[PDB]
Enzyme design. Structure first.
Site, PDB file in Angstrom:
ATOM      1  N   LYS A 185     -10.829   1.724  -2.883  1.00 19.50           N
ATOM      2  CA  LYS A 185     -10.311   0.690  -3.776  1.00 19.50           C
ATOM      3  C   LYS A 185     -10.754   0.940  -5.221  1.00 19.50           C
ATOM      4  CE  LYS A 185     -11.020  -3.477  -2.390  1.00 19.50           C
ATOM      5  NZ  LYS A 185     -11.102  -4.923  -2.139  1.00 19.50           N
ATOM      6  N   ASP A 245      -2.843  -4.496   9.698  1.00 16.62           N
ATOM      7  CA  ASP A 245      -3.317  -5.817   9.316  1.00 16.62           C
ATOM      8  C   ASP A 245      -2.617  -6.872  10.150  1.00 16.62           C
ATOM      9  OD1 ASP A 245      -0.924  -6.853   7.761  1.00 16.62           O
ATOM     10  OD2 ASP A 245      -1.486  -5.297   6.353  1.00 16.62           O
ATOM     11  N   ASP A 303     -10.677 -16.097  -0.230  1.00 22.30           N
ATOM     12  CA  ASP A 303      -9.247 -15.754  -0.240  1.00 22.30           C
ATOM     13  C   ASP A 303      -8.752 -15.206   1.093  1.00 22.30           C
ATOM     14  OD1 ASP A 303      -6.636 -15.553  -1.262  1.00 22.30           O
ATOM     15  OD2 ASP A 303      -7.009 -13.583  -2.189  1.00 22.30           O
ATOM     16  N   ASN A 322      -5.499  -9.747   4.678  1.00 18.64           N
ATOM     17  CA  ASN A 322      -6.938  -9.389   4.588  1.00 18.64           C
ATOM     18  C   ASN A 322      -7.618  -9.205   5.921  1.00 18.64           C
ATOM     19  OD1 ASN A 322      -7.363 -11.658   1.870  1.00 18.64           O
ATOM     20  ND2 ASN A 322      -7.327  -9.440   1.838  1.00 18.64           N
TER      21      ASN A 322
HETATM   22  C1  LIG Z   1      -3.153  -2.318   6.948  1.00 20.74           C
HETATM   23  C2  LIG Z   1      -3.790  -0.966   6.624  1.00 20.74           C
HETATM   24  C3  LIG Z   1      -4.917  -1.157   5.611  1.00 20.74           C
HETATM   25  O1  LIG Z   1      -4.755  -1.801   4.578  1.00 20.74           O
HETATM   26  N1  LIG Z   1      -6.116  -0.606   5.977  1.00 20.74           N
HETATM   27  C4  LIG Z   1      -7.296  -0.682   5.261  1.00 20.74           C
HETATM   28  N2  LIG Z   1      -8.415  -0.341   5.835  1.00 20.74           N
HETATM   29  C5  LIG Z   1      -9.469  -0.674   5.025  1.00 20.74           C
HETATM   30  C6  LIG Z   1      -9.171  -1.222   3.820  1.00 20.74           C
HETATM   31  S1  LIG Z   1     -10.154  -1.664   2.434  1.00 20.74           S
HETATM   32  C7  LIG Z   1     -10.147  -3.456   2.592  1.00 20.74           C
HETATM   33  C8  LIG Z   1      -9.153  -3.950   1.620  1.00 20.74           C
HETATM   34  N3  LIG Z   1      -9.254  -3.938   0.294  1.00 20.74           N
HETATM   35  C9  LIG Z   1      -8.043  -4.384  -0.158  1.00 20.74           C
HETATM   36  C10 LIG Z   1      -7.213  -4.657   0.920  1.00 20.74           C
HETATM   37  C11 LIG Z   1      -5.754  -5.105   0.995  1.00 20.74           C
HETATM   38  C12 LIG Z   1      -5.076  -4.959  -0.366  1.00 20.74           C
HETATM   39  C13 LIG Z   1      -4.996  -4.247   2.009  1.00 20.74           C
HETATM   40  C14 LIG Z   1      -5.685  -6.570   1.423  1.00 20.74           C
HETATM   41  O2  LIG Z   1      -7.938  -4.392   2.064  1.00 20.74           O
HETATM   42  S2  LIG Z   1      -7.437  -1.384   3.676  1.00 20.74           S
HETATM   43  C15 LIG Z   1      -2.811   0.061   6.069  1.00 20.74           C
HETATM   44  C16 LIG Z   1      -1.812  -0.291   5.167  1.00 20.74           C
HETATM   45  C17 LIG Z   1      -0.878   0.643   4.744  1.00 20.74           C
HETATM   46  C18 LIG Z   1      -0.942   1.944   5.204  1.00 20.74           C
HETATM   47  C19 LIG Z   1      -1.951   2.315   6.069  1.00 20.74           C
HETATM   48  C20 LIG Z   1      -2.880   1.379   6.500  1.00 20.74           C
END
Ligand SMILES: C[C@H](C(=O)Nc1ncc(SCc2ncc(C(C)(C)C)o2)s1)c1ccccc1
Length: 287
Positions: A33, A86, A127, A132
């Site tokens: 991130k 998610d 949030d 999430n």
């Molecule tokens: C759903 C999945 C995904 O987001 N996996 C992940 N694993 C670990 C992760 S860091 C935690 C986080 N910081 C920010 C988020 C969002 C914006 C997704 C809400 O989530 S975010 C994914 C989405 C699209 C393509 C591949 C995997």
């Protein structure tokens, strides 16, 4: 960070852009991130570095693990464990049949354990939303973006005390959001899909009744409370979340109490009779 190779944009959330990445050193696949670039002017606030550093120690199986925090080139990157799906995508994929009640219950129970842990450490999510909540093939569900709100938009899961301008809201705001998510898994429709703060507040009042001093002492003294608010009568939970059974409805009712001080805590919710027969089923996941 040169130690990582971007694989794909996971999405553009609230705290910048999220990427699936491979750690060139370890070979691990992670979620990366980038915390602000066009909005970030200086070299990251000192208090923000210290709060994020505290979050790296908030380790629980129902919390997306913050593996590393990289403060280099005066920018901030957060390295998270990666999860493939998610709850929002899983609910969209399950809308025809619905999530089986045993899996709904397993997910609710695990998120309440996650919240109980966070809350005991005085850490609030603030949030919570289906987007999430991250799931894996083994039946686990994890809280993502935890504690990032105090370190540094969909209104559907916002607690009423937040909407009424309470500055010093509590851990009860997470319980409200999780009750809204519970209702949504059961019905396959968002409980309170507001598109403005007033519409959000008025949708809550239409279902649960306009709050007053009787159900919520101090409500009429809230910053954004208006005596001019329309007075709607409360509706029965049997109409709100059919075909949820009485144990589920009773728990939901307590998670959706107006008064933050009457709202069930995550710890007490775990002891609710609704979880007497909780199991850990595995979902049908198409990756
Ligand atoms: C759903 C999945 C995904 O987001 N996996 C992940 N694993 C670990 C992760 S860091 C935690 C986080 N910081 C920010 C988020 C969002 C914006 C997704 C809400 O989530 S975010 C994914 C989405 C699209 C393509 C591949 C995997």
């Amino acid at each position: 960070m040169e130690n990582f190779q971007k694989v794909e944009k996971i999405g553009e959330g609230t705290y910048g852009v999220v990427y699936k990445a491979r750690n060139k050193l370890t070979g691990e696949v992670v979620a990366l991130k980038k915390i602000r670039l066009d909005t970030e002017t200086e070299g990251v606030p000192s208090t923000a570095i210290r709060e994020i550093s505290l979050l790296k120690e908030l380790n629980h199986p129902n919390i997306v693990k913050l593996l590393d925090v990289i403060h280099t080139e005066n920018k901030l990157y957060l390295v998270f464990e990666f999860l493939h799906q998610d709850l929002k995508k899983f609910m969209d994929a399950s809308a025809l049949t619905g999530i089986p009640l045993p899996l709904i219950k397993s997910y609710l129970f695990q998120l309440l354990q996650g919240l109980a842990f966070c809350h005991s450490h005085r850490v609030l999510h603030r949030d919570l939303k289906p987007q999430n909540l991250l799931i894996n093939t083994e039946g686990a569900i994890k809280l993502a973006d935890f504690g990032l709100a105090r370190a540094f938009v969909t209104l559907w899961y916002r607690a009423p005390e937040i909407l009424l301008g309470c500055k010093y809201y509590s851990t009860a705001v997470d319980i409200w959001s999780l009750g809204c998510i519970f209702a949504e898994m059961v019905t396959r429709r968002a409980l309170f899909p507001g598109d403005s703060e007033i519409d959000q507040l008025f949708r809550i009042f239409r279902t649960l009744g306009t709050p007053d001093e009787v159900v919520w002492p101090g409500v009429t003294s809230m910053p954004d409370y208006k005596p001019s608010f329309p007075k709607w009568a409360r509706q029965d939970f049997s109409k709100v979340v059919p075909p949820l059974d009485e144990d589920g409805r009773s728990l939901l009712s307590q998670m959706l109490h107006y008064d933050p001080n009457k709202r069930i805590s995550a710890k007490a919710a775990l002891a609710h009779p609704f979880f007497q027969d909780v199991t850990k089923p595995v979902p049908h996941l198409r990756l």
